[model samples]
Target: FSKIESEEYNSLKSSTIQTIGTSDGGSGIGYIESGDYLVFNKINFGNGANSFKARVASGADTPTNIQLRLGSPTGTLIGTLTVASTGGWNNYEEKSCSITNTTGQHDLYLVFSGPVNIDYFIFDSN
Candidate 1:
């Protein structure tokens, strides 16, 4: 199990968000707004991944919804993770959801609905 940082997103709407250093030793993507998304290209899963997890944080927003879309921003909706405010933006928490129809190589899109900071994501096959 490995994590892919938000700063490493292959394609993104950079103007809509910013990056910040995490206490955990890497940078995170913050100031995320609605319609903002990050795409990871050609993510390979040998067979299939069953779960999606993201390390995220929110400041003022109570609940921010993040959609995991396969292929594109508006592609197949594989999973959705809801992140609650963690007192501060630097205060991070891990949220996850079950995913379906994921296999082989595909672009992964992390689509946001509200403001939040994302550190990284982990995909699980088991």
Candidate 2:
């Protein structure tokens, strides 16, 4: 993913290319199965918190439920936002949520539950 700055210090960021993983890829990282999700490397949005955004292109036939979460390496969930959508692989949707006290070390993840064909999920910040 690439970061794009807009209006001085204020910025909007997006992933330039889609990251993919297969089901048979062994250890989970990008692939989606019964319980798998994508994690964005720890990010610090300077001070004053920030807004998190995501866009998903799914290959699933049934609707899939997704969650934007803040967690630690210890696997503790701090906060979450759920998004549900049903669309073809070519169709996509974006969602955004605001977060506070997200400074310093923290992990951001898009967690998925339920059946899915799994395409790609993108994340950004502003």
Scored by TM-score, the top model is: 1
Kindly list the per-residue Cα lDDT of model 1 for residues 1-126, writing each as its tens digit: 246888888889646687778767879888788889998988886577888888887886478888988887899998899888888888888888888847888888889987888898898875
How far is 15's C-alpha from truth in model 2 (Å)? Answer: 23
User: lDDT tens string, model 2, 34-64?
Assistant: 3455555554545535555544445565556
* lDDT (Cα) of model 1: 0.83
Model 2: residues with Cα > 4 Å off, grouped in runs: 1-31, 48-50, 59-62, 71-78, 115-126
Candidate 2 clashing pairs, residues 3+ apart or interchain: none
The 10 consecutive residues of candidate 1 with the worst lDDT sum are: 14-23
If candidate 1 were superposed on the true structure by all CA atoms, what would the RMSD be?
Answer: 1.6
What TM-scores do the predictions have?
Answer: 0.91, 0.50
